[PDB]
């Protein structure tokens, strides 16, 4: 997650192993029932896309469901690109390239670029946007679990 | 002796001044030929009437998106885009003319004029020329920029062609 330090700014902290474990335990007991969606959203506040993928990659089993999810995230990434055409550069010092779909999902962006977007002013909230995609994906795969 | 192109620059329709460029066709012949042909408008499309849509003071002025006018467009005389010819020339200071791109080998029509030394652009953007006369016009264009590139006035290429 991104958090504020004693001096004012937002800075990166690593995901808590206890958060991860809570998530793991919710899935073991509940599978992908509806009630997991609000759990995920609560447990992922301020998460970077790398944090979000750690949470998803800890789920054991539910392989059908996880592929469904990935396919939904992939649709949203493609639609983001369709609606945000790339603008030719050069990149000014202090600036960052504009995130693509793949970047927001963490596939092509490093943790430092993610921190870079999430802490810019004005912020490009790649964490919040990816989480939205994931939550849509969860709202689809929970059909298999009523 | 290197081809020479000129731009007459205007702001909200009123003349500002002419800027002229030497194009280093010996070092990067295809990239220089693209910019010259686009400046004369000899293949029926090019720079005349288009805008410097992104000006960042202390950095550069960027124009040449004659299709979509915001940096998402542009095309070369070789097709949608062409490869990075080489990176022999570097960003050594103000007046350097270089290709804007969206990653390696995606040169189209967009270019920038450096208003400082932009060393970290070396090996990313193809440098193909330099301002020969009228660096005061580019220094006067800077005024109308902003830190994110948005301009407070329409900076247009009122006219252009080849001097030499």
Swiss-Prot record, chain A:
PPIA/CYPA-binding loop: annotated segments: 85-93
Subcellular location: Virion
Region Interaction with human PPIA/CYPA and NUP153, annotated ranges: 57-95
PTM description: Phosphorylated possibly by host MAPK1; this phosphorylation is necessary for Pin1-mediated virion uncoating.
Modified residues (Phosphoserine): 16
Quaternary data: Homodimer; the homodimer further multimerizes as homohexamers or homopentamers. Interacts with host NUP98. Interacts with host PPIA/CYPA; this interaction stabilizes the capsid. Interacts with host NUP153. Interacts with host PDZD8; this interaction stabilizes the capsid. Interacts with host TRIM5; this interaction destabilizes the capsid. Interacts with host CPSF6. Interacts with host NONO; the interaction is weak.
Entry function: Forms the conical core that encapsulates the genomic RNA-nucleocapsid complex in the virion. Most core are conical, with only 7% tubular. The core is constituted by capsid protein hexamer subunits. The core is disassembled soon after virion entry. The capsid promotes immune invasion by cloaking viral DNA from CGAS detection. Host restriction factors such as TRIM5-alpha or TRIMCyp bind retroviral capsids and cause premature capsid disassembly, leading to blocks in reverse transcription. Capsid restriction by TRIM5 is one of the factors which restricts HIV-1 to the human species.
Record-given protein name: Capsid protein p24
Organism: Human immunodeficiency virus type 1 group M subtype B (isolate NY5)
Upper classification of the organism: Viruses, Riboviria, Pararnavirae, Artverviricota, Revtraviricetes
Gene name as annotated: gag
From Swiss-Prot, chain B:
InterPro entries in UniProt: Cyclophilin-like_dom_sf, Cyclophilin-type_PPIase, Cyclophilin-type_PPIase_CS, Cyclophilin-type_PPIase_dom
Post-translational modification N-acetylvaline, affected residues: 1
Residues recorded with modification Phosphothreonine: 92
Catalytic function, reaction form: [protein]-peptidylproline (omega=180) = [protein]-peptidylproline (omega=0)
PTM entry text: Acetylation at Lys-124 markedly inhibits catalysis of cis to trans isomerization and stabilizes cis rather than trans forms of the HIV-1 capsid. PPIA acetylation also antagonizes the immunosuppressive effects of cyclosporine by inhibiting the sequential steps of cyclosporine binding and calcineurin inhibition. Acetylation at Lys-124 favors its interaction with TARDBP.
Modified-residue entries (N6-acetyllysine), positions: 27, 43, 75, 81, 124, 130, 132
Residues listed as glycosylation sites in the UniProt record: 107
SUPFAM superfamilies for the chain: Cyclophilin-like
Keywords: Acetylation, Apoptosis, Cytoplasm, Glycoprotein, Host-virus interaction, Isomerase, Isopeptide bond, Nucleus, Phosphoprotein, Rotamase, Secreted, Ubl conjugation
An annotated Gene Ontology molecular function: integrin binding
Effect in UniProt of substituting residue 124 to R: Loss of acetylation and interaction with TARDBP
Cross-link for Glycyl lysine isopeptide (Lys-Gly) (interchain with G-Cter in SUMO2), residue positions: 27, 81
Compartments where located: Cytoplasm; Secreted; Nucleus
Cross-link (Glycyl lysine isopeptide (Lys-Gly) (interchain with G-Cter in ubiquitin)): 27
Function: Catalyzes the cis-trans isomerization of proline imidic peptide bonds in oligopeptides. Exerts a strong chemotactic effect on leukocytes partly through activation of one of its membrane receptors BSG/CD147, initiating a signaling cascade that culminates in MAPK/ERK activation. Activates endothelial cells (ECs) in a pro-inflammatory manner by stimulating activation of NF-kappa-B and ERK, JNK and p38 MAP-kinases and by inducing expression of adhesion molecules including SELE and VCAM1. (Microbial infection) May act as a mediator between human SARS coronavirus nucleoprotein and BSG/CD147 in the process of invasion of host cells by the virus.
Annotated protein name in UniProt: Peptidyl-prolyl cis-trans isomerase A
Name of the coding gene: PPIA
């Amino acid at each position: 997650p991104i958090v504020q330090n004693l001096q004012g700014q937002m800075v990166h902290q690593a995901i808590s192993p206890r958060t991860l474990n809570a998530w793991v335990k919710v899935v073991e007991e509940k599978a992908f029932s509806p009630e997991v969606i609000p759990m995920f959203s609560a447990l992922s506040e301020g998460a970077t896309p790398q944090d979000l993928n750690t949470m998803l990659n800890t789920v054991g089993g539910h392989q059908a469901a996880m592929q469904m999810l990935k396919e939904t995230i992939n649709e949203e990434a493609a639609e983001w690109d369709r609606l945000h055409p790339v603008h030719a550069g050069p990149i000014a010092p202090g600036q960052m390239r504009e995130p693509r779909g793949s970047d927001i999902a963490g596939t092509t962006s490093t943790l430092q670029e993610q921190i870079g977007w999430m802490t810019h002013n004005p912020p490009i909230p790649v964490g919040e946007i990816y989480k939205r995609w994931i939550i849509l994906g969860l709202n689809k795969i929970v059909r298999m679990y009523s | 002796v290197n081809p020479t192109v000129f731009f007459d620059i205007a702001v909200d329709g009123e003349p500002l001044g002419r800027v002229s460029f030497e194009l280093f066709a010996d070092k990067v012949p295809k990239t220089a030929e693209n910019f010259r042909a686009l400046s004369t408008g000899e293949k029926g499309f090019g720079y005349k009437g288009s805008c410097f849509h992104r000006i960042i003071p202390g950095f550069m002025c960027q124009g040449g998106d004659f299709t979509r006018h915001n940096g998402t467009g542009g095309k070369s005389i070789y097709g949608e885009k062409f490869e990075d010819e080489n990176f022999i020339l570097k960003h050594t200071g103000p007046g350097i003319l270089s290709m804007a791109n969206a990653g390696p080998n995606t040169n189209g029509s967009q270019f920038f004029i450096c208003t400082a030394k932009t060393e970290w652009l070396d090996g990313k953007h193809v440098v193909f020329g330099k301002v020969k006369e009228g660096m005061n016009i580019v220094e006067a264009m800077e005024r109308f920029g902003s830190r994110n590139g948005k301009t407070s006035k329409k900076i247009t290429i009122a006219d252009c062609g080849q001097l030499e």
